[PDB]
Amino acid sequence: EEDASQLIFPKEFETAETLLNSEVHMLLEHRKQQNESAEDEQELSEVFMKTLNYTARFSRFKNRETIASVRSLLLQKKLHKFELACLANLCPETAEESKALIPSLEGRFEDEELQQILDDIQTKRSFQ
Amino acid sequence: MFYHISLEHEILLHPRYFGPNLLNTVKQKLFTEVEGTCTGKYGFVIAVTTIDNIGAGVIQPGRGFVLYPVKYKAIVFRPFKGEVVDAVVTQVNKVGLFTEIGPMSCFISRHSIPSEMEFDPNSNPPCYKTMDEDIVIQQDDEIRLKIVGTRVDKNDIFAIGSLMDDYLGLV
Amino acid sequence: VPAALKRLAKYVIRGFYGIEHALALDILIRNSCVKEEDMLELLKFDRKQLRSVLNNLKGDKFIKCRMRVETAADGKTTRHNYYFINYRTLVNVVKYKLDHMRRRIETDERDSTNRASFKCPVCSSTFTDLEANQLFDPMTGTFRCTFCHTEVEEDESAMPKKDARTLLARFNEQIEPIYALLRETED
Ligand SMILES: [Zn+2]
Asked: Where are the zinc fingers (C4-type) (chain C)?
């Protein structure tokens, strides 16, 4: 009934906001900071640790400002919220690669313009 | 996909927890109950970002508990059919490959694995390799799999990974 | 009454029905309309047997019947059942039996897919492939069921599926000659 490729999601997943892995890591890191405070409180569950490692491993942006800049640029482009998370997560190198992964992305913009959008993410991306 | 949503939960507070810090106990009790529990409709819950509001605590007639409905914002991940998500291989076996995506665990059947891939029992670390060794998949590697289907049982969700589709596997 | 309709009615009746049905059709072929009583005397069949055959012929609407009520010479009421062949209704019903069989191929194929691929022979309980992983113990290294504490084998569930496939292509052979027969309906 729900397919990511077809951009079909249940009524619950309509107003939901998609957060990038780097953004997800920032919120989780804040939780860790709060975890240290108020000693003797409940220890964070292992599931929290699993996700924190996962988001950190795939973190495409290690700087808070870069994440905000990428989101601001993406906001100008008329892109679906779910597709924005995939675009900033997978970070396809070529426009054709992005189109193949997401069949719904075909026809949204021009192929030449699509490649330019991906190239911009690479410049903001930090390589270590 | 990671989603930040508002969830509705009901907390039954024992009368012993009444008095000062009642709301604090409700907030603290919410974290313990929600964390470590998963549901099919909303998927695994990692942590509660914040508590939107604590509703009126209706006293249960005869029972003595007070039912506190809580609106809280938490981030959850759910496997979507026909979606490609990066995965990490935990264990390698001839029958199938086990991969973990955060809290969610995905199992890859041998049939779904590409034909050219073959189990490597001779090697000390079990792994799947081709005749030409162009692509090698072993334990603790980042691979891409397609979620063929999702099944939920005993408040646990797991998906099926298939590498038949292009742009999949170790990159 | 074109000879094509007469020729086919014999061909179809002799194929999916016994000699009893074919013999009754021959009488209606020779004469457009024939009384039920007259057919009974000619065929010498039992009253119940003839009625059952006629009812079956009425079930597929190959031949229609009309009831005539009159007064006999002695004054007693006479109710004679006159049977006549309705080719226009016959063609539609016989044609319906084609598409159902033709579309029956898809329905039969779904039956094989219903059978589960994985099963547990010792406990005689079907095991879901996914549920096997949860039932599977990583320490043991092989899937097993706690209640019976024995290994599982899915090879047994494989053999029944293969046989059913032969039953399908074998099914199509039956309706192949009839396809030629029904071409006389359109002509
Ligand atoms: Zn068993």
From this structure: 120-148
Q: How far apart are CA B50 and CA B52, in angstroms?
A: 6
Q: For helices A46-58 and A21-36, give the axis angle rounded to 10 degrees.
A: 140
Domains held by chain B: number: 2
Distance in Å, CA C148 to ligand 1 centroid: 5
Across the strands, what pairs with B9? B70
Query: CA B44 → CA B64, B76, B104, distances in Å?
Result: 31, 5, 8
The residue type at A51: T
Which residue has 């679906």 as its token pair? A80
**Helix residue ranges per DSSP H, A9-94:** 21-36, 46-58, 64-76, 81-90
**Can you say whether the dihedral through the CA atoms of C141, C143, C148, C154 is positive or negative?**
negative
Domain ranges of chain A: 1-128
- Measured between beta carbons, the chain C residues lying within 8 angstroms of B93 are 141
Q: Name the experimental technique.
A: cryo-EM
Whether residues B48 and B119 share a domain: the answer is: no
What is the span of the domain harbouring residue B130?
81-171
Tell me the structure's resolution in angstroms, rounded to a single decimal: 2.9
Distance CA C32, CA C94 (A): 20
Is C177 in contact with C169 (CB distance < 8 Å)? no
Regarding whether B171 and B88 lie in a shared domain, the answer is yes
Backbone φ and ψ of C117, nearest 5°: -75, -35
Judge if B14 and B69 occupy the same domain.
yes
Residues B95 and B111 in one domain: yes
Domain match, B92 and B25 both: no
A93 neighbors A122 (Cβ within 8 angstroms): yes
Q: Of B45, B80, B115, which closes a domain?
A: B80
**Within this chain, do residues B165 and B89 fall inside the same structural domain, yes or no?**
yes
Which of these three, B80, B96, B129, is where a domain ends? B80
Do B1 and A85 touch, CB atoms closer than 8 A? yes
Do the chains contact at C134 and B153, CB–CB below 8 Å? yes
User: Is B65 found in the same domain as B52?
Assistant: yes
**Could you tell me if C139 lies within 8 Å of chain B, comparing CB atoms?**
no
Which of A4, A19, A31 shows the shortest C-beta gap to B83?
A4
- B85 in the same domain as B68: no
